[PDB]
Design a protein around this ligand. Structure first.
Ligand code: 3PE
Ligand code: 3PE
Ligand code: 3PE
Ligand code: 3PE
Ligand code: LFA
Ligand code: LFA
Lengths: 476, 504, 100, 54
């Protein structure tokens, strides 16, 4: 333990100290404004302190943790997702008659688990980060537990995530039984000379794949996604869809990078089948959806399928990590803007009894700039050029072409066409004909407008994002 | 140097058309006319200063102008524009059709007319960018960014008599067709770039460096097939055509959208500029399939045109038949047939523009497109039936119009190359005469078949009349004097032909 | 003297028993009970793996696993109390309004 | 015989197939938590068997 290792820990320490400070401030008085401001101050401070961690370099802070620019990029994505979640949550929580302050404590603790997953280099840290993003999401998905749909989503996500955690833990135990070391780099070290595909290592990785693919909404562990997305509070849906997926795919990226069993052909084939099915099924199930939450859940299934396609080309290609980074930036901004428009139209919280239907038809004729942002993100998630979602799609196609993954490339094209149908249906329904007022709602509108402007600007001009993603390099 | 401004002037003009929407409702049409006239006059200036008639074929690449600025240096992607004779003819055609499109939507005084003008100039700038780009990623970028404005105005500004669901369906069909085919073209582009990088070791999307790419026979076939699938959706080639009549029928009522987006033939340019020089051997093996698809397109489009009761669908299927002729021409490898294809592209643009403008006017006066509800309209209108007679006469390929020069020069070169296909295509010209006379008899001749056809109709406005007469004069001048057009595009056509036949 | 395979197989038997109890039961309480069974089986497998290698890491992962089990049992029983308060029955098939 | 544009219908066939496949796939989203757990265990079985047969 060195004090430079303490310099590498600043996002973790700052988020934990924000957790303690917000908790004690709640214990003093219940003030929604003050506690929300303390939460966003702590998240902004950790986002700023990422610069000091970058000046600190890159080192292995523990047998558990390892921090490099890869980890700082994922930490920044998770912190931006959390800040947007709090910003959307305040006009939502203005209408919540029960305690509005526990929301921010759970959001901060989930951001702490996301940071741990961003920096995790160990099976113990991976398990801990998974559970640290899961349990606050149990609280947040059913924060409005008196609402029937929110209680349904809470029960579904809690039961299914406990089951997936059991699967992941059992797989980790079998992997440790084979390997004798919970470090990522030793998962396949004791094998060799073509004996990489040990059956117990493969089965342990299969159970971990079940747990993590539940966590990534990958087919066939995907059926929870539209129900949980629809039932959850809209800022909670934003946080789930952005932060949970990004953090877990970052740690899966790192696990398949440093594990020697990541070069197994069997795991590659299984992940290829999962990516193919995820793309096709998520695009096909969203064709006839009139609910924007379920539609965005199926969309998240398809986009994680594209991300998995970028994951398969890890060992054969070289631009796979950069492809995942650029795709994750575009996906983060796109899903942030989309679920943010849903959030501000679902704000304030009207109660457990009233319906929370979005009703996007005719949004332009009473709320035009949010309609423009919503259709910009619809074009971005469709992968249309002039959007950063296309830049991510282009990177995924480049790594699929370079690694000769022709089935996945054809799946990307076909699922893209089906996505064009349903995304354009939503985007043109925004301009059809249908039958707030404080500064926090304006701040949420500012957040979605900024994310839309960023996705448009990096659609037309993607070079700064490419350069800053390439700046991130891991400890290979 | 002046090509970046060639793409940028329509974009800034549409942006200012949207921005100065606050100053009035009839304000943005003048701004639209100003920016389209500026693009047209700049293209005419670069034509007059080009000196293409005194240019000799010196191989590929050979541009009158070129420009490179690094945009995504990570992949070696740059904004790389260039221009030579064929692309200059295409951009002059684009400017003229854009001016006609602006003049066509003159009386559309709506609240959101400025956004319609912004969409129209985004479309026109995208077409010009496809015609000027020689970076493959950048060319594909323009190829796909023409889509979004066209989709939005078909879905929202389209044919008001039909329900919104029909317009949305036509727009979604068009978007899905062209965007899926564009993604297939992107796959081919990425595979070509990666093959060159594996062969040499440098990242490039430059067209001039990707030409010397050593590929095995079969990989080149697949790259050619991806390019051809994109260029065949947009051509149109049967059976990838149905988006074209559904998009024409659900296009906005004025007819400007038909001129701005569809009636410019970027797919034939893509086949000449990219499919033949990058994959000459694969195009040589693919030539009989493309020629028989062209023959099928000619006769199927003729039979479809005869079967319509809607005039707009008839004109769309006429376009399908004419582009079947062009598709036969492009794969002959013949200089005479290539020049005939260039003339046919220009003449088809002018003649179909005149037909669509006249059909939009006729729908404005009679409020129906059904040919069973009209008849005897020669005695009811002052100018429209005779100009429609001229454009249907040009449509069947009558000498004295540019369509005859294009079709018969195509058939001369093709008969020098492929005689049987030429014979079948000339009987397709007989079919063209049949459907043109059928449309003339069903619309303007006989007795009135309804109540609206029995009434005297108002005469056309002077702006529409003058732009129709300008199209008439240009078509007649093309038919009687096509030599400046041939001398403009002789060098580029010659270089493409020499690269195609000196590689097989 | 004790095989590692026998401990791993015992953990697998308890895990699949917990999964069966999770699936077949309509009452939410027995679903939570099956979840506790599965997570205890996973913790047991980690203890067996750590004891085979002579490492503390198996017992440490056991501690982390039972911390998770305590947290999940707390949250699940809170949700079950909420369900019994709102709907007066623990039938999980009645909590099925969102579909499509 | 050709007035209904048969080639357009034969190219419209994949849209019909996509609509039918999406309608069929949406039946598995019945909203039952027990079926969601069952589908997770079925997918675990499929993944484990696929990893074992390679
Ligand atoms: C449904 C819509 C989407 C379309 C379907 C999805 C795409 C399908 C693409 C199928 C490609 C099949 C390739 C078969 C061989 C692969 C393995 C192999 O042996 O590759 C050979 C070669 C690598 O060896 P190398 O030494 O690099 O050779 C240099 C010469 N090129 O490999 C190479 O050099 C690279 C080969 C690349 C081949 C071109 C790939 C793209 C072609 C355009 C799209 C597909 C065709 C058009 C659409 C079909 C109908 C939808
Ligand atoms: C010639 C062969 C060789 C070259 C092949 C080139 C392939 C790419 C270019 C051609 C693409 C053809 C696409 C055909 C369908 C186009 C979409 C369409 O027609 O949508 C309309 C329809 C909605 O309209 P409606 O019938 O009113 O339905 C009411 C809805 N409740 O929409 C629907 O009902 C749902 C639409 C779902 C999304 C569209 C379907 C996508 C299917 C995959 C496309 C990729 C290509 C796969 C291979 C195609 C066949 C070769
Ligand atoms: C829900 C709807 C969607 C799902 C259902 C519909 C299906 C979707 C998928 C359709 C596309 C399937 C894949 C097509 C590409 C197959 C590639 C292949 O098999 O390549 C083999 C070979 C590769 O080249 P090779 O010879 O190995 O090179 C090294 C030494 N020369 O290749 C060769 O040697 C060249 C082979 C050329 C012929 C094969 C490609 C046919 C393409 C058909 C469509 C286009 C037809 C032409 C245009 C029609 C009019 C537009
Ligand atoms: C002869 C020896 C040498 C052989 C060379 C090849 C064949 C040449 C054939 C020459 C003889 C063709 C005579 C066609 C006379 C058609 C006149 C007629 O009766 O037209 C009726 C109809 C009118 O069209 P419409 O405006 O729709 O009127 C309402 C429908 N009653 O119009 C129609 O029904 C249209 C009929 C079109 C027939 C075209 C045949 C082309 C053959 C190409 C091969
Ligand atoms: C291609 C990248 C994105 C381009 C912009 C997409 C649209 C954004 C919103 C702009 C303003 C839209 C105004 C629509 C007015 C519709 C009026 C219809 C009248 C019938
Ligand atoms: C439904 C999705 C269909 C995708 C088709 C992709 C075709 C891939 C062909 C691969 C051929 C490899 C030859 C070696």
């Amino acid at each position: 333990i060195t004090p430079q290792n303490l310099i590498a820990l600043l996002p973790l320490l700052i988020v934990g100290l924000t957790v303690v400070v917000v908790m004690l401030s709640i214990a003093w008085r219940r003030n929604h404004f003050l506690n929300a401001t303390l939460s966003v101050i702590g998240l902004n401070a950790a986002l700023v302190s990422l610069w000091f961690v970058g000046q600190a370099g890159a080192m292995d802070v523990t047998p558990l943790m390892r921090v490099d620019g890869f980890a700082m990029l994922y930490t920044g994505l998770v912190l931006l997702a959390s800040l947007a979640t709090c910003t959307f949550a305040y006009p939502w929580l203005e209408g919540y008659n029960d305690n509005k302050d526990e929301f921010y404590l759970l959001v901060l603790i989930a951001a702490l688990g996301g940071i741990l997953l961003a920096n995790a280099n160990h099976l113990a840290s991976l398990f801990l980060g998974i559970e640290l993003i899961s349990l606050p999401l149990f609280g947040l998905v059913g924060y409005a537990f008196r609402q029937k749909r929110s209680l349904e989503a809470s029960i579904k996500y809690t039961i299914l995530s406990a089951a997936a955690s059991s699967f992941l833990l059992f797989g980790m135990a079998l992997v440790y039984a084979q390997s004798g070391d919970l470090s990522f780099v030793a998962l396949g070290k004791n094998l060799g000379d073509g004996m990489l595909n040990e059956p117990l290592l493969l089965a342990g990785f299969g159970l971990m794949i079940v747990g993590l693919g539940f966590k990534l909404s990958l087919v066939p562990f995907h059926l929870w996604t539209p129900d949980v997305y629809q039932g959850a509070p809209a800022p909670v849906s934003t946080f789930l869809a952005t932060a949970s997926k990004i953090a877990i795919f970052g740690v899966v990226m790192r696990l398949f990078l440093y594990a020697p069993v990541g070069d197994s052909e069997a795991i590659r084939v299984v992940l290829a089948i999962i990516a193919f099915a995820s793309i096709i099924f998520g695009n096909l199930m969203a064709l006839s959806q009139t609910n924007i939450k379920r539609l965005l859940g199926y969309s998240s299934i398809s986009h994680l399928g594209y991300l998995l396609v970028a994951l398969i080309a890890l060992q054969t290609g070289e631009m796979s990590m950069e492809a995942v980074g650029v795709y994750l930036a575009g996906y983060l901004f796109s899903s942030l803007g989309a679920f943010g428009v849903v959030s501000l139209m679902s704000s304030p919280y009207r109660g457990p009894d009233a319906d929370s239907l979005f009703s996007y038809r005719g949004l332009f004729w009473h709320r035009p700039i949010l309609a423009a942002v919503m259709t910009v993100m619809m074009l971005s998630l469709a992968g249309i050029p002039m959007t950063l979602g296309f830049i991510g799609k282009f990177y995924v196609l480049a790594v699929g072409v370079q690694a000769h993954l022709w089935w996945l490339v054809g799946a990307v094209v076909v699922g893209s066409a089906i996505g064009l149908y349903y995304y354009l249906r939503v985007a043109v329904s925004l301009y059809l004909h249908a039958p707030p007022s404080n500064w926090q709602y304006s701040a949420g509108g500012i957040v979605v407008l900024i994310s839309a402007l960023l996705v448009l600007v990096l659609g037309v001009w993607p070079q700064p994002l490419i350069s800053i993603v390439r700046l991130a390099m891991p400890l290979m | 140097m002046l090509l970046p401004w060639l793409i940028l002037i329509p974009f800034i003009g549409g942006f200012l058309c949207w921005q100065t929407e606050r100053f009035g409702v009839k304000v943005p049409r003048w701004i639209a006319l100003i920016t389209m006239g500026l693009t047209l006059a700049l293209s005419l200036q670069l034509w007059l200063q080009g000196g293409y008639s005194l240019t000799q074929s010196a191989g590929i690449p050979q541009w009158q102008s070129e420009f490179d600025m690094p945009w995504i240096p990570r992949f070696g992607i740059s904004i790389h524009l260039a221009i030579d004779g064929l692309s200059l003819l295409m951009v002059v055609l684009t400017g003229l059709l854009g001016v006609l499109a602006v003049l066509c939507s003159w009386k559309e005084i709506e609240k959101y007319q400025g956004f319609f003008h912004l969409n129209l100039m985004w479309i026109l700038g995208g077409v010009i960018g496809v015609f000027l780009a020689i970076d493959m990623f950048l060319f594909f970028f323009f190829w796909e960014m023409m889509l979004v404005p066209m989709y939005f105005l078909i879905a929202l500004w389209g044919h008001k008599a039909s329900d919104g669901k029909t317009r949305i369906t036509a727009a979604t069909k068009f978007f899905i067709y062209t965007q899926a085919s564009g993604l297939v073209m992107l796959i081919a582009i990425l595979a070509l770039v990666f093959v060159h990088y594996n062969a040499t070791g440098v990242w490039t999307f430059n067209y001039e460096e990707l030409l010397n790419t050593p590929m095995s026979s079969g990989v080149e076939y697949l790259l050619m097939l991806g390019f051809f699938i994109a260029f065949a959706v947009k051509m149109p080639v049967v059976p990838l055509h149905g988006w074209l009549p559904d998009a024409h029928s659900q296009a906005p009522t004025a007819g400007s959208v038909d001129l701005a987006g569809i009636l410019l033939k970027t797919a034939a340019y893509g086949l000449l500029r990219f499919s033949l020089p990058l994959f000459p051997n694969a195009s040589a093996e693919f030539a009989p399939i493309a020629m028989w698809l062209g023959v099928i397109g000619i006769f199927y489009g003729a039979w479809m045109a005869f079967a319509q009761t809607d005039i707009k669908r008839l004109i769309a299927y006429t376009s399908v038949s004419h582009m079947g002729f062009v598709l036969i021409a492009i794969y002959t490898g013949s200089q005479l047939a290539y020049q005939g294809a260039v003339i046919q592209m220009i003449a088809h643009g002018l003649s179909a523009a005149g037909l669509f403008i006249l059909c939009g006017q006729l729908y404005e006066r009679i409020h129906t497109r059904d040919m069973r509800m009209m008849g005897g309209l020669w005695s009811k209108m002052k100018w429209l039936p005779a100009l429609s007679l001229f454009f249907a006469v040009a449509t069947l390929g009558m000498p004295g119009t540019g369509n005859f020069v294009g079709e018969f020069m195509i058939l001369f070169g093709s008969f020098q190359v492929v005689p049987v296909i030429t014979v079948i295509s000339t009987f397709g010209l007989v079919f063209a005469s049949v459907y043109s006379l059928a449309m003339l008899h069903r619309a303007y001749f006989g007795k009135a078949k309804s109540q609206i056809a029995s009434q005297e109709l108002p005469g056309m406005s002077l702006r529409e009349l003058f732009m129709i007469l300008l199209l008439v004069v240009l078509l007649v001048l093309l038919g009687f004097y096509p030599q400046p057009i041939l001398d403009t595009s002789h060098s580029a056509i010659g270089n493409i032909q020499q690269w195609f036949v000196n590689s097989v | 003297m004790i095989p590692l395979q026998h401990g791993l197989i015992l953990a697998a038997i308890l895990f699949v028993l917990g999964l069966t109890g999770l699936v077949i039961r309509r009452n939410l309480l027995f679903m939570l009970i099956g979840l506790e069974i599965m997570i205890n089986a996973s913790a047991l497998a980690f203890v067996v793996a750590g004891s085979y290698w002579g490492q503390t890491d198996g017992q440490v992962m056991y501690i982390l696993a039972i911390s998770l089990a305590a947290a999940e049992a707390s949250i699940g029983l809170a949700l079950l109390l909420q369900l019994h308060r709102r709907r007066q029955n623990l039938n999980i098939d009645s909590v099925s309004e969102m579909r499509g | 015989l050709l007035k209904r544009d048969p080639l357009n219908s034969m190219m419209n066939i994949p849209a019909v197939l996509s609509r039918f496949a999406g309608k069929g796939l949406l039946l598995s989203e019945n909203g039952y938590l027990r079926w969601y757990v069952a589908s997770m265990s079925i997918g675990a079985v499929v993944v484990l068997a696929l990893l074992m047969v390679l």
